[PDB]
């Protein structure tokens, strides 16, 4: 299967399959059973910032998402990431709806990754376009003309729909680690708005690292984010 | 044919073509009769440094090669770049070898694109730096003879196991990810490129010269481009 | 007299020194009057954003101010400002008024300088970016009526509590430390420089600009520079 | 006195005031005895590369000293750093000997400051300046020709002066940590050239983080680097 890691922006707790109650962001280390969560009050209809940060030296990956009235949620987890991703990567944003639904809305997305021993790559998007070319869409993931990219799928009444899995990743590989390197380190940042009339809404969004041929996994969408094909 | 924008660093002085006399710097608008050269003082089996920078507003673009001992030349040309390149290309590296050869040795290689708007930090940016080339370079396109190497460096055109340069040879290096070069509603476009590069020969005359390149998305070696072509163009046209 | 290059948004025509009849941005060079401008739409109350991009190999002053509604006006002067500025600068944003009154008000900054040479980055740089003013802005000169703000806002001139611009007024903002211009050996040296502004007005006529500029680091308000003169010479000459 | 949280390449085992047995490099908060050290293998004359991370997310001050041949020690330490600075600081290089001495040569420095909530500040120095207008030098401190910082004093004939101390502060003050934001990150750079003909080398190299209006403390050479006015 694919490797991932993925820092999680979950809306709907699955406590059946690790979730805590409650929505949450967590850490993902090759499972959708996050290694470590935190308590997350997702503000409907408002515009989100999720930031991801690691380094090879303190080898701590850790993430915070918060809102414009000051309100946030962070997560750490410590785990040396050259055990598990490999060299070379794709890195994408993921989002899902299953038998509730909300918008996936990423406004914007920016990524660093170094090698100092300096090789590195830096890439912002702060308006999308319709056709992104330095972006791999995949599943129900598209960009409009309103400068954002819509992971899952949504009406032209501007309605999400459900059982919805969408995909961006960035077109070129990257070169996550490198056994020369004295710092390997990323980061990332995007934001996001997430809407729900739904009583409830699912699934989440994630940022995410993966093989370089990673592709939407088979009946990934509601809880598994497309992310992972089962909930081991 | 494709389209393509260059800066040459023309190690070999073809005047039959419209070069100048004498080796020689040069930018090239789809053509390789350079609008615009300076003469250029290749130090042979030195490393020298180009920078190439573009924007929007003062539309010149300027490039500066100069070696360690402090001698450099250098070369603007008013242009308008909207008006030449595809709103998506891709950016690179190429060089070439004919009857008279010369290492076409890349050491390092960085790239910046930014496109500004409206407000601010309503930034779009592409950037990357190579300071070290990998055997398996997977954020790279490789066309021709151009191949990377766990020395580090990015050999654009071929070499002999013994070191030796050859000839008649030609290659290419793309960054794997279209450049989104120009955008209508951007307030400023902007690009800068560095590289660094080793030129050796042995011969009685280096030839051809390397060049930073912006293509078309899909440009790929022209037929017979070696030599005095440089990999980019089809014909002296 | 301190050593002034300046990119002016003038709100204000003064025909009688070398204004052109209309608002405009203007490239200014040891002087008020503009080397350069272009006609200028200032957008009363409207947050606009300039750019003012330069680089030595180019010698290509240039900049552009533009609004959300897509309007824009650009300049470009070609000049050496090697033989212009002194090695070592301050850079800072000058605002003033005089019969006629406007805001003045910063709501973002960020400014590169890079000074690049003979191999690869061996590179000094400096950047800063300020997106919110602090009350207590310790990286800032503020000098004349210049304040920042807990509304995260720079006010280069005075403004009231109820909101409203006062007349006769005159303030600059300058990064805290001395910037690196140019360096003789250096291949490279560029500079860029953005911010955003919001001058609104409910006079007449607004008066009188806001300019980016760069001087010797012990510049200061010239006296009696409120007015046409921006905060930035001694006189019209 | 003043405030400092500072990485110390410690070359010389003082161990009766905290140091290990050995030369090593430490995290110092307010104090010269390290809270987290790691043993360090000085390559006499080498050019070395030390990198200092840290980010209010994960809350880990990390840093890494290397050389060329590929040789490193690294140490991270758990700290919250907003309850130990002021919110506006200086950010420098300190370097000192004693009864033994060497070289305290830097070759380069970068620093970069950002908070997201982006205010940011990035310097690079690859060669100093004879005058260089943006560094307060204190001590014995000077920038030549060479477009080398020497932090501590050698003779006209290169020969490392004892009884030496001197610091490179950036000029401006940095806005290091701010309430409102959601990340607040800094990272540092150095090379740097330990040269010793005696038969110990010393005293060593610290970045440093200090209160804006910080001066060499009296009698700080030596095992004090340069940071702190006593062994507390
Ligand atoms: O542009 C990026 O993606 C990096 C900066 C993140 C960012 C840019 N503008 C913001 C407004 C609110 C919260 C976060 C941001
Ligand atoms: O220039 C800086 O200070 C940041 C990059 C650090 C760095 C630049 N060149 C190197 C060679 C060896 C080891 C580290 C480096
Ligand atoms: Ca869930
Ligand atoms: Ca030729
Ligand atoms: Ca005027
Ligand atoms: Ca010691
Ligand atoms: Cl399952
Ligand atoms: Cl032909
Ligand atoms: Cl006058
Ligand atoms: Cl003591
Ligand atoms: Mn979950
Ligand atoms: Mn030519
Ligand atoms: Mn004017
Ligand atoms: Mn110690």
Redesign the interface.
Known sequence: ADTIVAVELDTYPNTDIGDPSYPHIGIDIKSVRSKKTAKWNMQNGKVG?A?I?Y?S????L???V?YPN?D?A?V?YDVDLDNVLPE?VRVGLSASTGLYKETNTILSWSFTSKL????????????F?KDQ??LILQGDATTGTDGNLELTRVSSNGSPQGSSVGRAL??????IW?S?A??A?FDA?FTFLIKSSDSHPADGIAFFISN?DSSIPSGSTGRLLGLFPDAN
Chains 1, 4 share one sequence.
């Open positions: 910032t930031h940060i380094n030296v303190g080898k701590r850790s993430a915070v918060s000051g946030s962070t750490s070379w100092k021993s300096t090789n590195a790559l830096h890439f912002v998007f702060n308006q376009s070319k330095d960035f077109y070129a590989p990257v070169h490198e020369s004295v710092v380190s940042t370089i």
